Amino acid sequence: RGEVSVCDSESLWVTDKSSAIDIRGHQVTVLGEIKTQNSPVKQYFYETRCKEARPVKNGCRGIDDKHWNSQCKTSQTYVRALTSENNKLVGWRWIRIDTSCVCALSRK
C-alpha cells in the first residue's frame, strides 16, 4: 500500500457519443446502435481520461522539477466504431477515444 501514480485518472462508460475524430482526421458521427444480427445492441465505449493536468502543481507527481517540466495529458488510442459522415457512407471506422492519462516531459 505505498504505490502512487505520476498522474491520476478516471474511467467511465460513455453511452451518448455522437461525434469523433477518425484515423484520417475527419469529424464523423458515431451511431448509437449496431442494428445487425438483429438485436439491436447499443454502442458504448470504455473511456479513461486525466482527472486534471496537475496532481501536484509543478506538473505531474514524482518529477524532478529541478530540471523538468511536466503536465498530465489525456492520451488516445484507436477503436473501430460504426459511424457515418455527412449522414452518408455508414461504416466501421477507426476513431480516437481517450484511453489513459500520461505525463509529458519538457526540458529547461
Added chain:
Amino acid sequence: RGEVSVCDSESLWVTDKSSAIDIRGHQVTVLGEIKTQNSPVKQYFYETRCKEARPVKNGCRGIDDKHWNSQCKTSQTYVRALTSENNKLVGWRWIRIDTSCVCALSRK
C-alpha cells in the same frame, strides 16, 4: 455403368413450404424467412421423394415377387425449421420432410 436402384427418385429445392407435420404430430406453419442476424435469409429445403410407387409393376425393381410384395414409398427425416402454430409460438421445431425413396417389403 451397370448399377440400377430398386426405386427411382427426384431431388428438388422446395422454396414455398408453408405447412408441415412436426415431431409431436401437429400441423405447424413454416415461415418463409429467417429474419434475425438481419439479412434476412429465405427458408428452403432440399427434398427428395419417389418418382412413383412402382418402377417395374410388381412393386420395386430387382425384388423376388415369387415370394415378396413391394412398393416404393417416400420416407421422411426430421429437420429443424422456424415455424409458428395458430400464428403464435414462433420457434424452431423438428418437422418431417421427404428425404428419400425406399422399398417396402411384405410377405405372402
Added chain:
Amino acid sequence: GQLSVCDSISEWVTAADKKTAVDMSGGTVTVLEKVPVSKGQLKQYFYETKCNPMGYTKEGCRGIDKRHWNSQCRTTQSYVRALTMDSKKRIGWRFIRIDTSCVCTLTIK
C-alpha cells in the same frame, strides 16, 4: 405389416460430436455448436439415419432376385442448412451433407 429392404438406424448428432462437414460446394466446414437466436442460444444438432452396420442387410438387401441380381445397402446423404464457419473463417448458413437414408442398389450379375 411391412419390412425395409435395407436395415437402418437413426440418431441425434450434435455439432459437437460432428465437428466438420462438407458443404454443397465441396468445402470442409466447421459446424458451430450453438446458434444465437432471439432469447439466447440454440444447441445445433441433426437427425441422421444410416445403414445399420449390424443389421441383417449387411451383405445384400432383403427380397432380392439373387438370380439376376447382386445388391447392396448403402447410406445416402441429403443437404441440411447449418450455421457453419469455413476455411477462411467466415460464419454463415450453408447446406451441408448429412446421412438421411439407407437404400438398396442392384448391379446386373
Added chain:
Amino acid sequence: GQLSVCDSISEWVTAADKKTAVDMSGGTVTVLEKVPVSKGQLKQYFYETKCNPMGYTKEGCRGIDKRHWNSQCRTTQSYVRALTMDSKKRIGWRFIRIDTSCVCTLTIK
C-alpha cells in the same frame, strides 16, 4: 517539443495473432477472426499500445526525483468490444481487455 515519461510502442493486432482474451468478467474468450456485416466479412483487429520493452525507460521512468522515489513503467489495459465466443461456445459481443498504454508508477523509497 515534449517527451514521454515512459517509452511505448503501438501495433495493429489481429484476432488471428491474438486468439484468446479475458472479458470484463474474468473469463477467457476466443476472439473471432471475421465478423459478418452487411456486405460481407470484416477482419477483426485491434490497435494496441504497450511499454516498449526495449525503450530507454526499461528500469525506471524518465524525469523522476530519484531521491524520494522508485519508479517503473507498466502497461495498463482498457476494455474494447469484440465478437467473441466463450467457453460454453456462445458467440457474442463482449468487452475484452487489451493493452492501451504504458504509465509510470512510483513507490516511496
